[PDB]
Amino acid sequence: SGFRKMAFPSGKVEGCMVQVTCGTTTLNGLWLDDTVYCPRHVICTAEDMLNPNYEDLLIRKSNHSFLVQAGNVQLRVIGHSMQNCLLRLKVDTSNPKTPKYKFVRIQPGQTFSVLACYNGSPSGVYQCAMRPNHTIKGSFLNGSCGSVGFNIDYDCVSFCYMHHMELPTGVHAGTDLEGKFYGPFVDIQTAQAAGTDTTITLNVLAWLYAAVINGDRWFLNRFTTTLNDFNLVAMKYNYEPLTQDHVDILGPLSAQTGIAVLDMCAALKELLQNGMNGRTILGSTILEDEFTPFDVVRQCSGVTFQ
Numbered sequence: 219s220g221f222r223k224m225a226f227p228s229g230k231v232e233g234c235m236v237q238v239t240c241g242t243t244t245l246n247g248l249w250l251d252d253t254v255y256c257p258r259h260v261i262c263t264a265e266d267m268l269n270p271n272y273e274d275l276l277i278r279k280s281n282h283s284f285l286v287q288a289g290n291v292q293l294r295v296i297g298h299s300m301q302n303c304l305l306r307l308k309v310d311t312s313n314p315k316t317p318k319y320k321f322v323r324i325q326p327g328q329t330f331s332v333l334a335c336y337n338g339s340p341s342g343v344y345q346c347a348m349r350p351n352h353t354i355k356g357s358f359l360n361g362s363c364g365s366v367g368f369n370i371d372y373d374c375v376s377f378c379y380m381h382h383m384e385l386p387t388g389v390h391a392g393t394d395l396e397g398k399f400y401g402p403f404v405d406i407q408t409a410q411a412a413g414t415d416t417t418i419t420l421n422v423l424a425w426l427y428a429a430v431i432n433g434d435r436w437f438l439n440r441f442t443t444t445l446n447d448f449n450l451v452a453m454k455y456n457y458e459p460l461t462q463d464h465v466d467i468l469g470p471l472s473a474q475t476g477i478a479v480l481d482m483c484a485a486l487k488e489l490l491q492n493g494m495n496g497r498t499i500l501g502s503t504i505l506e507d508e509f510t511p512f513d514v515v516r517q518c519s520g521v522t523f524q
């Protein structure tokens with residue numbers, strides 16, 4: 219029993235973190251095979267960041283303008299190219315700890331684990347969701363750029379995030395591993411701000427199913443709702459509209475608990491209208507939205523408690 223935010227074991231990623239230095243900037247890169255991936259702003263000073271031109275900044279560097287460290291070993295760069303917002307550096311050695319892996323662009327609402335690194339050295343791990351406004355509520359200090367996000371299935375690591383910047387509200391933005399930002403953000407130190415965010419409805423429902431699988435049913439009710447009357451209520455409380463594809467996604471959880479997804483939407487609609495009356499769900503006093511349906515099935519018993 220119990221339900222916690224849970225990150226994937228981080229060993230396979232820890233064996234890929236390195237340190238990358240260009241001039242006086244140092245940050246983290248990701249060493250798979252014979253490439254090292256890192257934020258392309260490692261080639262910038264503080265002042266360049268106001269208005270950089272990366273193409274023009276990069277033609278000015280050589281292979282030996284980049285220093286790559288892996289533990290105590292110096293790795294020798296033999297090639298470099300820019301890919302959108304990342305650099306790929308080719309190094310003279312193939313990472314012997316490279317895991318089976320793939321690169322994925324995750325979609326708002328999905329979750330992943332982040333290995334926070336400083337100077338190529340892993341310091342912590344936590345789980346977070348991609349918000350609808352394309353930020354994440356990370357925990358990151360200066361020097362954490364190049365820290366990655368990932369999911370693990372079987373033995374295969376799906377890398378899906380690289381950390382590039384922190385926004386004024388204290389949220390974090392970054393890219394996939396082909397260098398394309400998540401959201402409307404760019405690697406320029408120019409006024410930028412998180413767009414308004416929304417509660418991830420699919421996840422709240424998934425988490426209410428969790429609560430039922432463990433054995434708690436206090437927040438259910440006798441009512442059902444149409445999809446459409448749900449949404450009139452959802453918008454008013456700044457929840458994402460529920461779509462039929464989100465309803466189909468919840469099928470398995472609906473089936474494990476015998477609660478119909480709309481019936482759960484009526485449960486939620488009533489939670490939104492009345493509060494929780496000082497009660498809790500899975501230990502929380504507030505509706506939680508950073509567990510996906512897949513996160514609930516992965517963590518919960520396949521046998522409902524009742």
Ligand SMILES: O=C[C@H](Cc1cnc[nH]1)NC[C@H]1C[C@@H]2CCCC[C@H]2CN1C(=O)c1ccc(-c2ccccc2)cc1
Nearest residue numbers: 259264358359360361362363382383384404405406407
């Ligand atoms: O390496 C980590 C940081 C990101 C981060 C820090 N804390 C959590 N995450 N890298 C931020 C870098 C690069 C980034 C690229 C996108 C546009 C914003 C920049 C911000 N970065 C700077 O180098 C930077 C640091 C400090 C200031 C600053 C300091 C004092 C007053 C105003 C600005 C401006 C830029």
